[PDB]
DNA sequence: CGGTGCTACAAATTGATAAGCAATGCTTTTTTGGC
DNA sequence: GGCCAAAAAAGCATT
DNA sequence: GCTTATCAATTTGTAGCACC
């Protein structure tokens, strides 16, 4: 399911909200997750999960193509943390 | 942190939507998602990230207080890949 | 609009197993803006 | 909403 | 090829948000 297909079902399903009002819900929501992660600040959707940020120390990388070594500055990194209610709901397995 | 609450919240503001529909979008956005994963499906999220599915065999684990040996149960767990957009967008961001 | 009780959530334990990644050119997929 | 070409983004290699 | 994440059970302080 991709962002456009995502739009077109909640879209679907409510008959009672515009299909472009649903469109720029979307946009609007996913960027406004996007810059609070920017802003190095936390997501926490109880039931859902949470977005947080994990730092990466400096390190001496490699490009893996060539073998030239490559100095990277430390930073950080998208995390998300499935919440119970989205955990069960996607583990099929007993 | 962000919550459904503030992201209503915008929703409301920067598109004067009613706060009845600025909450039930929230939610349903959220909801759709996690439907799409009960079923087996992946969610890719362009410009954000792709939520994927992987199958986990069981393997060795433990109680970290006692140390009890246990096994970790197999399962199917939900990972997150962001993707690089959002990587760069949050490389240099300072933990508030 | 606002108070709040329920509880998911975060964190911190150990240690075997699993997942992710540095650079980057080329290919593929998705989104975009016009009709 | 569909179609199209262009552009953005992701995917692949291996990542 | 090396670094980081996953996870077990239990406790304990915190906070999302449904429901009034």
Redesign the interface.
Known sequence: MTKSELIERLATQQSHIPAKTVEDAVKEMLEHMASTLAQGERIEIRGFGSFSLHYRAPRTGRNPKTGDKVELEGKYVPHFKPGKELRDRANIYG | ????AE?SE??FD??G?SKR??K???E???E???R???N??????????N?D?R?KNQRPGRNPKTGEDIPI????????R?GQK??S????????
Not at chain 2, 40 to 49: A, H, N, R, T, Y
Not at chain 2, 73 to 80: E, G, I, K, L, Q
Not at chain 2, 89 to 96: T, W
């Open positions: 942190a962000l919550t459904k992201m915008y929703l920067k598109l939507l529909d600025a039930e979008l929230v349903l956005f959220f759709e998602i996690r799409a994963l009960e087996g499906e992946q969610v890719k999220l362009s410009g954000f990230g939520f599915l199958d149960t197999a399962r199917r767990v939900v990972t997150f962001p959002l990587k967008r949050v490389e240099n961001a300072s933990p508030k």
